[PDB]
Short mmCIF file of C-alpha atoms in Angstrom, two decimals:
data_model
loop_
_atom_site.label_atom_id
_atom_site.label_comp_id
_atom_site.label_asym_id
_atom_site.label_seq_id
_atom_site.Cartn_x
_atom_site.Cartn_y
_atom_site.Cartn_z
CA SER Q 1 2.35 48.30 -14.52
CA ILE Q 2 1.00 44.79 -14.09
CA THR Q 3 0.80 44.55 -10.31
CA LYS Q 4 -1.45 42.17 -8.43
CA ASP Q 5 -3.51 45.09 -7.17
CA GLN Q 6 -3.74 46.67 -10.60
CA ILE Q 7 -5.29 43.41 -11.72
CA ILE Q 8 -7.88 43.62 -8.97
CA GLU Q 9 -9.15 46.95 -10.24
CA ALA Q 10 -8.93 45.46 -13.71
CA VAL Q 11 -11.51 42.80 -12.95
CA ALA Q 12 -13.73 45.50 -11.50
CA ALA Q 13 -13.26 47.42 -14.72
CA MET Q 14 -15.03 44.92 -16.94
CA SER Q 15 -18.45 43.32 -16.77
CA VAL Q 16 -19.16 40.03 -15.04
CA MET Q 17 -19.66 38.35 -18.39
CA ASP Q 18 -16.37 39.71 -19.67
CA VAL Q 19 -14.82 38.25 -16.54
CA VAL Q 20 -16.40 34.86 -17.14
CA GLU Q 21 -14.53 34.84 -20.43
CA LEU Q 22 -11.32 35.74 -18.63
CA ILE Q 23 -11.52 32.88 -16.16
CA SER Q 24 -12.66 30.69 -19.03
CA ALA Q 25 -9.68 31.69 -21.14
CA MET Q 26 -7.21 30.38 -18.60
CA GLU Q 27 -9.07 27.10 -18.36
CA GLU Q 28 -8.41 26.55 -22.04
CA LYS Q 29 -5.02 28.23 -22.13
CA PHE Q 30 -3.55 26.19 -19.31
CA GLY Q 31 -5.86 23.43 -20.46
CA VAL Q 32 -6.72 22.66 -16.86
CA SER Q 33 -10.01 21.10 -17.89
CA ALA Q 34 -9.39 17.54 -19.01
CA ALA Q 35 -8.11 15.02 -16.49
CA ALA Q 36 -10.74 12.99 -14.67
CA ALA Q 37 -13.53 14.91 -12.97
CA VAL Q 38 -16.90 13.29 -12.44
CA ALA Q 39 -19.65 12.45 -14.91
CA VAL Q 40 -22.92 13.87 -13.65
CA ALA Q 41 -24.74 13.81 -16.97
CA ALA Q 42 -28.21 15.00 -16.07
CA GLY Q 43 -30.48 14.65 -19.08
CA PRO Q 44 -33.22 17.16 -19.95
CA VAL Q 45 -36.71 16.34 -18.72
CA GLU Q 46 -38.32 14.02 -21.24
CA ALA Q 47 -41.76 12.47 -21.50
CA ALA Q 48 -42.20 8.78 -20.79
CA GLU Q 49 -42.51 8.63 -17.02
CA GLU Q 50 -42.72 5.44 -14.99
CA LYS Q 51 -45.58 4.27 -12.80
CA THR Q 52 -43.99 2.54 -9.82
CA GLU Q 53 -44.99 4.95 -7.08
CA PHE Q 54 -48.05 3.64 -5.28
CA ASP Q 55 -49.18 4.76 -1.84
CA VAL Q 56 -50.94 2.43 0.56
CA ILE Q 57 -53.13 4.19 3.09
CA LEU Q 58 -54.99 2.57 5.96
CA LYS Q 59 -58.55 3.78 6.45
CA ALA Q 60 -60.05 1.29 8.88
CA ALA Q 61 -58.32 -1.58 10.63
CA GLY Q 62 -61.72 -3.21 10.83
CA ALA Q 63 -62.56 -5.94 13.32
CA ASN Q 64 -59.01 -7.23 13.14
CA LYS Q 65 -56.76 -4.61 14.71
CA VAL Q 66 -54.52 -7.49 15.70
CA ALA Q 67 -53.75 -8.75 12.22
CA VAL Q 68 -53.56 -5.15 11.07
CA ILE Q 69 -50.98 -4.18 13.66
CA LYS Q 70 -49.00 -7.15 12.42
CA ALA Q 71 -49.25 -6.10 8.79
CA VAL Q 72 -48.22 -2.61 9.85
CA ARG Q 73 -45.11 -3.31 11.89
CA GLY Q 74 -44.50 -6.11 9.41
CA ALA Q 75 -44.48 -3.74 6.46
CA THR Q 76 -42.52 -1.14 8.38
CA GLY Q 77 -41.02 -2.34 11.64
CA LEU Q 78 -42.15 0.43 13.95
CA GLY Q 79 -42.40 -0.25 17.66
CA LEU Q 80 -45.52 -2.10 18.77
CA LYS Q 81 -46.62 1.16 20.36
CA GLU Q 82 -45.87 3.35 17.37
CA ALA Q 83 -47.83 0.91 15.24
CA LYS Q 84 -50.69 0.91 17.71
CA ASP Q 85 -50.87 4.69 17.78
CA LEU Q 86 -50.59 4.80 14.01
CA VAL Q 87 -53.62 2.58 13.54
CA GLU Q 88 -55.37 4.40 16.36
CA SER Q 89 -54.68 7.61 14.49
CA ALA Q 90 -56.43 6.38 11.37
CA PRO Q 91 -56.47 7.20 8.74
CA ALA Q 92 -52.73 6.61 8.51
CA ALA Q 93 -50.42 6.17 5.55
CA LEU Q 94 -48.86 2.72 5.57
CA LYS Q 95 -46.40 3.21 2.73
CA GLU Q 96 -45.58 5.89 0.19
CA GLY Q 97 -44.09 5.39 -3.26
CA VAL Q 98 -43.79 1.63 -3.03
CA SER Q 99 -43.89 -1.01 -5.75
CA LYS Q 100 -47.37 -1.97 -6.89
CA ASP Q 101 -46.61 -5.61 -6.15
CA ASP Q 102 -45.78 -4.68 -2.58
CA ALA Q 103 -48.79 -2.40 -2.29
CA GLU Q 104 -51.13 -5.14 -3.46
CA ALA Q 105 -49.30 -7.64 -1.30
CA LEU Q 106 -50.13 -5.83 1.91
CA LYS Q 107 -53.50 -4.81 0.54
CA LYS Q 108 -54.51 -8.43 0.05
CA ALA Q 109 -53.18 -9.09 3.53
CA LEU Q 110 -55.49 -6.45 4.96
CA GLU Q 111 -58.40 -7.93 3.05
CA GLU Q 112 -57.58 -11.40 4.32
CA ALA Q 113 -57.89 -9.98 7.82
CA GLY Q 114 -60.91 -7.91 6.87
CA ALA Q 115 -59.72 -4.32 6.88
CA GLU Q 116 -60.33 -1.28 4.71
CA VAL Q 117 -57.34 -0.17 2.67
CA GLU Q 118 -56.80 2.70 0.26
CA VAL Q 119 -54.76 2.63 -2.93
CA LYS Q 120 -53.73 5.90 -4.54
CA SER Z 1 -4.11 47.56 -24.54
CA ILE Z 2 -5.97 46.27 -21.50
CA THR Z 3 -7.25 43.14 -23.20
CA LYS Z 4 -8.39 40.01 -21.41
CA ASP Z 5 -5.93 37.82 -23.28
CA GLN Z 6 -3.11 39.95 -21.92
CA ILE Z 7 -4.34 39.07 -18.45
CA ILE Z 8 -4.14 35.41 -19.41
CA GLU Z 9 -0.46 35.51 -20.28
CA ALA Z 10 -0.05 37.52 -17.10
CA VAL Z 11 -1.07 34.59 -14.93
CA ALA Z 12 1.16 32.42 -17.09
CA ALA Z 13 3.93 34.94 -16.52
CA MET Z 14 3.89 34.93 -12.73
CA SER Z 15 4.36 32.13 -10.23
CA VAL Z 16 1.44 30.14 -8.88
CA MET Z 17 2.07 31.79 -5.53
CA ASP Z 18 1.69 35.20 -7.12
CA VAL Z 19 -1.56 33.96 -8.60
CA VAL Z 20 -2.71 32.66 -5.24
CA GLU Z 21 -2.07 36.05 -3.70
CA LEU Z 22 -4.03 37.71 -6.48
CA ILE Z 23 -7.07 35.49 -6.19
CA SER Z 24 -6.77 35.84 -2.43
CA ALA Z 25 -6.82 39.59 -2.89
CA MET Z 26 -9.89 39.69 -5.10
CA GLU Z 27 -11.50 37.24 -2.70
CA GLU Z 28 -11.60 40.01 -0.13
CA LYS Z 29 -12.28 42.87 -2.51
CA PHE Z 30 -15.17 41.29 -4.38
CA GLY Z 31 -15.99 39.36 -1.23
CA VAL Z 32 -15.34 35.74 -0.35
CA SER Z 33 -19.01 35.11 -1.04
CA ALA Z 34 -19.01 36.42 -4.59
CA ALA Z 35 -15.48 35.27 -5.33
CA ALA Z 36 -16.05 31.94 -3.62
CA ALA Z 37 -16.93 30.53 -7.02
CA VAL Z 38 -13.78 31.95 -8.56
CA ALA Z 39 -11.64 30.86 -5.64
CA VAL Z 40 -12.74 27.24 -5.77
CA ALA Z 41 -12.73 27.34 -9.55
CA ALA Z 42 -9.24 28.78 -9.63
CA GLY Z 43 -8.00 26.80 -6.65
CA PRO Z 44 -7.14 23.81 -8.85
CA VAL Z 45 -6.03 25.91 -11.80
CA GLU Z 46 -3.28 27.36 -9.65
CA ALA Z 47 -2.18 24.08 -8.10
CA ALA Z 48 -2.10 22.37 -11.47
CA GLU Z 49 0.64 24.75 -12.54
CA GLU Z 50 2.77 23.49 -9.68
CA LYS Z 51 2.07 19.93 -10.72
CA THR Z 52 0.97 19.25 -7.16
CA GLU Z 53 -2.49 17.84 -7.79
CA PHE Z 54 -2.40 14.14 -7.00
CA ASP Z 55 -5.50 12.12 -6.19
CA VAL Z 56 -5.44 9.33 -3.63
CA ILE Z 57 -8.27 6.86 -4.11
CA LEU Z 58 -9.09 3.89 -1.92
CA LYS Z 59 -9.89 0.72 -3.84
CA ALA Z 60 -9.78 -1.99 -1.19
CA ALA Z 61 -9.38 -1.54 2.55
CA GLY Z 62 -7.93 -5.04 2.58
CA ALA Z 63 -7.78 -7.17 5.70
CA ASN Z 64 -7.34 -4.06 7.82
CA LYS Z 65 -10.56 -2.09 7.62
CA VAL Z 66 -9.76 -0.85 11.10
CA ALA Z 67 -6.48 0.85 10.29
CA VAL Z 68 -8.00 2.02 7.03
CA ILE Z 69 -10.97 3.70 8.68
CA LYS Z 70 -8.42 5.42 10.89
CA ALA Z 71 -6.35 6.62 7.96
CA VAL Z 72 -9.54 7.82 6.32
CA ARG Z 73 -11.13 9.83 9.10
CA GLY Z 74 -7.58 10.76 10.04
CA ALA Z 75 -6.88 12.23 6.62
CA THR Z 76 -10.30 13.83 6.47
CA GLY Z 77 -12.24 13.84 9.72
CA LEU Z 78 -15.58 12.55 8.49
CA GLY Z 79 -17.93 10.88 10.94
CA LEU Z 80 -17.15 7.27 11.76
CA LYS Z 81 -20.23 6.37 9.75
CA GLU Z 82 -19.46 8.57 6.78
CA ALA Z 83 -15.98 7.09 6.73
CA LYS Z 84 -17.38 3.58 6.93
CA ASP Z 85 -19.75 4.15 4.04
CA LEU Z 86 -17.00 5.87 2.10
CA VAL Z 87 -14.68 2.90 2.43
CA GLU Z 88 -17.57 0.55 1.76
CA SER Z 89 -18.39 2.59 -1.31
CA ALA Z 90 -15.02 1.95 -2.91
CA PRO Z 91 -13.60 3.18 -4.93
CA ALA Z 92 -13.62 6.38 -2.91
CA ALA Z 93 -11.49 9.49 -3.20
CA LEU Z 94 -9.45 10.01 -0.05
CA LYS Z 95 -7.85 13.25 -1.17
CA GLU Z 96 -8.06 15.43 -4.25
CA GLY Z 97 -5.44 17.84 -5.55
CA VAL Z 98 -2.99 17.28 -2.72
CA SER Z 99 0.79 17.45 -2.64
CA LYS Z 100 2.53 14.31 -3.83
CA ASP Z 101 4.33 14.05 -0.51
CA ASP Z 102 0.99 14.01 1.26
CA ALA Z 103 -0.48 11.55 -1.21
CA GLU Z 104 2.41 9.15 -0.73
CA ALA Z 105 2.27 9.71 3.01
CA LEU Z 106 -1.19 8.21 3.36
CA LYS Z 107 -0.45 5.72 0.60
CA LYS Z 108 2.46 4.28 2.55
CA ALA Z 109 0.19 4.25 5.58
CA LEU Z 110 -2.33 2.13 3.72
CA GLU Z 111 0.43 -0.22 2.61
CA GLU Z 112 1.70 -0.51 6.16
CA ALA Z 113 -1.76 -1.69 7.12
CA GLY Z 114 -2.07 -3.79 3.99
CA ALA Z 115 -4.62 -2.04 1.82
CA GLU Z 116 -4.98 -1.34 -1.89
CA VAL Z 117 -4.58 2.30 -2.84
CA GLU Z 118 -4.77 4.12 -6.15
CA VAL Z 119 -2.62 7.02 -7.30
CA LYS Z 120 -3.74 9.03 -10.30
#
């Protein structure tokens, strides 16, 4: 009496774990687990983190909203308006999680114009 | 003697179709939500037994990215963009675990257009 149905009630006769073994058995039996598949080798969290995530915030455009607006749209590319509003909505984040070099690049640009920047 | 092993040889005793029916049954019983994992996990296991799991990969669209993109979205139905990226992200799997006939069908289509396909 090995009917399809009988098997259904059979799976509901054992525990989930016991079932996991079942399904697993076939995998090995029919050896349907060794062809190509994908890698996806996610390693376990390990110390030694990087530090390349700097955020450049704009506090005050200063007496050079013009140059600022340029630096803004220049660093991003938002519409003149968007950029305007952004600055007008100070403080406003310029960039988030950008390379230090880039952060300092714009920063120095702001300074050259005479604006207040924030590095965090 | 209602062992698990015995259930293993049971699947290896019946035809893939009979196994499909089974899984399909449980799918409803235990629910398609709870069995979903088993269904997708067993989906390939069953097909493998029929030796009807061929993978069609796209290596190079060739000098006919147009026709290719068509074949792609045509074989799948992904957004124009998605398809574009896919092709541009070669190699890219077009189909996975499909009938040989189907695999060769698209393959020949690619050739007709003049593209490089991969069958594995």
